[PDB]
Each structure stands twice: as structure tokens, then as C-alpha cells.
């Protein structure tokens, strides 16, 4: 017994929880759950006239 899934999940959750900005002096990371909004995703159907008008 060794749920390596559990260990890998812990490691990834530890390593992927902070987002350093471009101008981030040492130790100024920000939590993703704080500074992460939700974008817009669409199954692309963008025509030429549609793109130009956009």
C-alpha cells in the first residue's frame, strides 16, 4: 500500500498554488484561487466578416 496518486496530488497541489507576476520581488507570490477569474471559452465558429466586425 502506497497511494502514489495521493503523494503526486499533494506535490502538484503544493507546487501549483501560487502565481508570480512579472514584477514580483522575492517572495511576493499570489494565490491562484485569489487572483484567478474565469475566462470565456468558445468552440470556434469565427467567420471572416465576423472577425473583422469583432
Amino acid at each position: 500500500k502506497k497511494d502514489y496518486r495521493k503523494k503526486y496530488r499533494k506535490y502538484v497541489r503544493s507546487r501549483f498554488q501560487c502565481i508570480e507576476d512579472r514584477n514580483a520581488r522575492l517572495g511576493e507570490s499570489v494565490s491562484l484561487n485569489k487572483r484567478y477569474t474565469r475566462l470565456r471559452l468558445i468552440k470556434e465558429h469565427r467567420s471572416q466578416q465576423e472577425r473583422e466586425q469583432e
Binding site: 506535490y11 503544493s14 498554488q17 522575492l26 517572495g27
Partner: protein, 212 residues
């Protein structure tokens, strides 16, 4: 700069940071930090603070849980040309003909790698060494092993702590894994008049010594 030069004697209390929970996660349900960076002026207390942490841990006054192998590693002493392997770097700070490494390094979740004087090697980091070993039973080349340890290739889940003069910052920021750093200041206003009472024998000495 200017005020502290003048007197900086005005009442300016602040909220202090503790030492036992220096590695605890920012919130309460996030992930614990795996790197801290003490930074302060030259000769301000980095090495003495590292020694204090080591001795307090040994006596069992902090980090009773968490980790139990705080391997002090001075930077000046560790020359980086020859063959430094993590096995030897753990033996050096471990008095024995052979310390159990296939058992010590078998739980990198419980370790600390206290370092010191990373300004001793600013010059040393210039070209990104392509070989980044990930094993503790190899001739790791020294400086390459140090860079791998900093980047958390060796024992990637082994906690760290780096003291350093503010002389690199930038070049260092390309190697740290989002480390929570702490700036050191010194004795504030009363810590001085308490330091005199620890350096000098009695009140008869200390009072006049401080007043002077």
C-alpha cells in the same frame, strides 16, 4: 535611511513574525512553503540565527515535528569544483563512519537544509548548468549539486532555508520555488539595552556601559 540616521527613536511598533511557524502555509488549508530566504545587511545576524535554530531544534524547542534532520551547510566552506555528492554533504554534518542515508533521505518530507552566505557564490552562478542531478548517490560535481538542491531537484519535497546578503536577489529569483523570504533588521530599541545586560556581568557595569 535618513530617519534611522537621525534617531529613529519615535514609537513605531510593528507586528512581529514568529519562528516555529515560518514554514506554515499562508492561509490554513493551502500548501506549506518549501523555501525561506533570510536576507539582511552584512553581519546582522544571519549565521547566528541559523545556529540558534539548529541548537533550539537539537534541544527540542522548535520544529519538534515537521523535520528532524536540519543539515547546516555553510556556503563558504563548500568549495564547488571537485565532486560534492549529497551523500558526502550529509555525511560531513553527521558524525559517523557511515550515517544511514538510504534511510535519512528516504523521507525528504522531513528535512531542513539550512544554508548560509549565499552571497559567497553570486559569481558562481552565471551559466545555467545543463546537468541538474536528481540523485544523492552520484558524483554531483559540486556547484551543479548546489544548483540542483536550490532548484529542488534533489529531494524536491525536502524543505529549505537560505540566508544571504542582499547582493543577488535578481539572479537568485530565477532559481527559487516561490520562496517566502524574511528580512532581518537587528535589535530594535530595547533589545539593545537588553543585549548589554547579557554581554556585561552585572548591573553596575551594564548601567554605565549602556548610558555611555
Amino acid at each position: 535611511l535618513l530617519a534611522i540616521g537621525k534617531t529613529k527613536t519615535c514609537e513605531s511598533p510593528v507586528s512581529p513574525i514568529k519562528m516555529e511557524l515560518l514554514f506554515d502555509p499562508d492561509d490554513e488549508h493551502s500548501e506549506p512553503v518549501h523555501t525561506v530566504v533570510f536576507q539582511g545587511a552584512a553581519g546582522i545576524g544571519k549565521t547566528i540565527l541559523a545556529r540558534k535554530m539548529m541548537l533550539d531544534w537539537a534541544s527540542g524547542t522548535l520544529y519538534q515535528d515537521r523535520f528532524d534532520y536540519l543539515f547546516y551547510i555553510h556556503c563558504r566552506e563548500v568549495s564547488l569544483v571537485t565532486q560534492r555528492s549529497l551523500g558526502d554533504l550529509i555525511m560531513s554534518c553527521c558524525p559517523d563512519p557511515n550515517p544511514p542515508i538510504h534511510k535519512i533521505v528516504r523521507k525528504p518530507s522531513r528535512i531542513l537544509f539550512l544554508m548560509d552566505g549565499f552571497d559567497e557564490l553570486q559569481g558562481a552562478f552565471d551559466e545555467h548548468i545543463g546537468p541538474l542531478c536528481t540523485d544523492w548517490q552520484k558524483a554531483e560535481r559540486g556547484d551543479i549539486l548546489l544548483s540542483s538542491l536550490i532548484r529542488k531537484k534533489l529531494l524536491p519535497e525536502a524543505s529549505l532555508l537560505i540566508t544571504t546578503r542582499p547582493v543577488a536577489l535578481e539572479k537568485l529569483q530565477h532559481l527559487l520555488d516561490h520562496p517566502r523570504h524574511v528580512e532581518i533588521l537587528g535589535f530594535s530599541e530595547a533589545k539593545r539595552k537588553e543585549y548589554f545586560f547579557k554581554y556585561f556581568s552585572d548591573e553596575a557595569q551594564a548601567r554605565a556601559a549602556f548610558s555611555l
